[PDB]
Design a protein around this ligand. Structure first.
Ligand SMILES: [Zn+2]
Length: 257
């Protein structure tokens, strides 16, 4: 009832999910000329040394690399955040062409893909409770451009053949998400939403300025995934991004000058 096709894509989502037209929807365009440096942001803290990946799942819209979130093992703190946010999963959005695929844009520039590392605020006890709160989630967004390969992505790429179709999962232990980060942690932040239904307005977005580079061959393997289930007509999983939404009564703050 929702997807990225010709008849169920983002422009239709409001019928089942009326917050699609809400006040704090994501993604947005980041205008680097109007985002203002905020010297109050605290330092941002990514603590992934104890991360425990478990599984990778094709959910029919993207693939999720899932983590054990039953202890503070991989946590995000600092920056704009109060308290501790635990990593639950990461996933990507990507294009059919290298000139599109990201959800956020920077001065209207679209990147080839965008990585979302999803974390929930431990004060709410579990993810399902957290998404009901305005400060329930913190999503670290990282742009991907096509150039050199990202060595830390290759283990993800190589398992995709085993999860080609919707509903397939595979064991995916011992994956280190630190290998997906750029050098700099400079970021923009603003209050927003999930970018897929139910589109809940529960996210503090933290979008890194520095993209990571992936190779053409790595992105091509993302584009071999399928939206459909096994034994259904093949529909390539491409262009699984929501376009920028109105900023409305929000300000984007920068961590850097
Ligand atoms: Zn996402």
């Amino acid at each position: 009832h929702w997807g990225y096709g010709k008849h169920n894509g983002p422009e239709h989502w409001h019928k089942d999910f009326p917050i699609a037209k809400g006040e704090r929807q994501s993604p947005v365009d980041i205008d680097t000329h109007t985002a203002k440096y905020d010297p109050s942001l605290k330092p941002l803290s990514v603590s992934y040394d104890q991360a425990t990946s478990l599984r990778i799942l094709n959910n029919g819209h993207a693939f999720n690399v899932e983590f054990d979130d039953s202890q503070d093992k991989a946590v995000l703190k600092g920056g704009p955040l109060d308290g501790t946010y635990r990593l639950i999963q990461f996933h990507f959005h990507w294009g059919s062409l290298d000139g599109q695929g990201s959800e956020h844009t920077v001065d209207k520039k679209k990147y080839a893909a965008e990585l979302h590392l999803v974390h929930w605020n431990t004060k709410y006890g579990d993810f399902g409770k957290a998404v009901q709160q305005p400060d329930g989630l913190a999503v670290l967004g990282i742009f991907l451009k096509v150039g050199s390969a990202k060595p830390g992505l290759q283990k993800v790429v190589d398992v995709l053949d085993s999860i080609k179709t919707k509903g397939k999962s595979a064991d995916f232990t011992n994956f280190d998400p630190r290998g997906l980060l750029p050098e700099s942690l400079d970021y923009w932040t603003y209050p927003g939403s999930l970018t897929t239904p139910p589109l809940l307005e529960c996210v503090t977005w933290i979008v890194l300025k520095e993209p990571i580079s992936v190779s053409s061959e790595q992105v091509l393997k993302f584009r071999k995934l399928n939206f459909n289930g096994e034994g259904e007509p093949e529909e390539l999983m491409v262009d699984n991004w929501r376009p920028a939404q109105p900023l409305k009564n929000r300000q984007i703050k920068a961590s850097f000058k």
